[PDB]
């Protein structure tokens with residue numbers, strides 16, 4: 001089935017992954033160098049064996065395509081994926097007045113949830129409405145929207161990296177230079193998340209357009225379900241904006257790890273029988289994907305198994 | 313055998329690669345997304361089925377480790393690999409006095425060879441001796457020595473990208489951030505070769521150190537034999553300078569192509585029976601690899617088949 005390379009990659013890390021400590025002081029079971037491919041013409045690979053909310057994928061991808069780095073856009077699409085990183089520059093802030101030394105304390109103490117949630121909804125709210133606050137605690141700076149569409153140049157000017165390569169696909173469909181990169185050597189030593197999705201490159205041969213991701217690091221239970229979808233989505237969109245048909249998404253990993261928290265959750269997923277894969281319908285009369293809205297992308301026939309709850 | 317993933321990757325591009333035009337207006341047979349791995353503890357993968365001069369590999373890698381971008385160092389190690397790109401800024405030069413509109417004309421007319429060679433040895437020579445000329449026509453600027461060790465920062469300062477990550481391996485052997493990148497979005501639109509070896513990242517688990525290459529583009533007959541060696545060499549060196557043992561080299565491709573010139577040459581190679589793989593002996597009392605010289609790296613027992621001549 002379309003999603004079987006995931007299940008395979010989750011299995012193989014179980015069966016032969018070696019133990020590895022991490023930045024997080026949770027353990028992991030880990031492998032270096034893996035490649036799964038997905039023939040995007042046989043359907044769309046939103047995993048069926050575990051529910052992955054496509055709505056969350058698309059808003060966040062449309063955030064990136066817009067060159068936006070503000071938690072606000074996300075927030076009016078009921079998308080909280082990036083919420084904690086904005087809250088953090090808030091709880092540290094010199095003018096903060098409310099105790100969140102906070103992610104390490106989610107499950108850790110239930111009575112935190114109350115006043116975490118309270119102080120987190122009290123902040124989401126005020127990003128939504130109060131512009132000064134939003135401009136200040138809601139803008140995440142150097143996350144994929146800037147790297148892709150406004151990469152901070154050395155002359156202080158700003159490069160439209162992704163736009164430029166789409167022109168380049170329109171124009172020189174065959175070059176092997178069709179690279180968008182999110183790895184800024186100038187920024188990775190001191191930056192909240194050095195990007196996991198470090199690079200990708202497009203490729204065109206005889207009608208179809210494919211994309212490969214180099215992902216330096218992959219939480220296989222939480223991160224990879226979303227990650228595969230966002231980047232297969234990206235491929236379709238560009239295929240679309242360029243009039244090409246879609247071919248492959250290739251997912252390449254450096255460190256592909258299962259957290260030790262996630263051991264039971266994965267085995268459970270692994271008993272689930274995957275279901276026929278949904279189809280993606282992009283709106284056939286709009287092409288300038290920098291101009292897509294939620295309704296321009298629709299997912300026919302996703303029939304997932306239930307979500308499996310997971311210690312981040 | 314150690315080199316069989318090459319022979320496999322050359323075979324697979326024959327048997328199922330699709331036709332593809334290129335920047336060069338030669339044809340190619342081409343595939344997107346491939347991964348071969350090499351267990352560096354079972355020997356060193358200098359291909360045995362075709363002669364690849366290790367001397368050329370090491371001088372050029374020591375050029376890179378030095379942060380050098382001048383054809384001169386290379387030239388005093390009898391290494392002409394990078395020669396043409398320096399000659400080019402010479403033949404264009406406003407003060408040039410000798411007709412080379414030149415690579416498209418190698419085999420094209422034999423009587424060119426005479427006066428190409430003549431005008432090329434006349435230039436190599438004068439890089440070797442005349443410093444002003446060398447500082448000017450011999451320095452290639454933005455090739456791997458600067459990206460790796462002096463990456464041009466936006467404050468006009470210069471980042472020691474590779475040095476920094478080696479410290480980081482010494483210091484945080486487990487992070488999945490151990491990335492050196494050679495892709496400068498600010499520079500790839502107007503730069504002679506946007507780099508083929510776009511990225512790599514190191515990885516450490518339980519004693520061994522591995523490296524993965526993302527190569528955007530690979531001439532499978534000419535480029536890949538050298539490429540695998542240079543990057544397996546890099547892995548050993550860093551394993552060495554960090555006291556780790558060596559584990560894997562993983563070679564990841566975007567566009568892996570066989571030129572149509574190279575069709576006969578490859579089939580021939582494919583009849584050759586590979587031989588047991590040489591061993592690499594790094595000098596066991598020196599560790600600061602930014603300080604290696606040719607004699608600090610030795611190759612026990614390379615027993616190659618003859619070189620196969622090839623239209624670049």
Ligand SMILES: Cc1cccc2c1C(=O)N(c1ccc(C#N)cc1)C2=O
Pocket residue numbers: 080081082084222223224225226227312
């Ligand atoms: C799965 C995926 C993919 C891309 C980006 C993200 C995620 C994700 O789960 N999160 C995420 C969502 C929620 C929380 C929390 N709490 C922490 C991280 C992402 O930022």
Ligand SMILES: Cc1cccc2c1C(=O)N(c1ccc(C#N)cc1)C2=O
Pocket residue numbers: 392393394396534535536537538539624
């Ligand atoms: C194989 C390999 C690897 C890395 C870098 C290089 C090569 C190579 O053959 N050349 C090369 C050598 C000679 C010529 C010519 N003439 C053109 C290109 C490289 O610059």
Ligand SMILES: O=c1ccn([C@H]2C[C@H](O)[C@@H](COP(=O)(O)O)O2)c(=O)[nH]1
Pocket residue numbers: 022023194196216217218219220222223224227257488489
């Ligand atoms: O889109 C994402 C973002 C983050 N992670 C995970 C991978 C790692 O387990 C974790 C920590 O990041 P690093 O240690 O690799 O920096 O974040 C993902 O899986 N997918």
Ligand SMILES: O=c1ccn([C@H]2C[C@H](O)[C@@H](COP(=O)(O)O)O2)c(=O)[nH]1
Pocket residue numbers: 176177334335506508528529530531532534535536539569
């Ligand atoms: O180390 C190298 C450098 C260049 N090439 C080849 C790959 C392509 O066939 C050719 C042209 O480069 P691009 O078209 O990908 O830019 O150079 C290699 O194989 N190895």
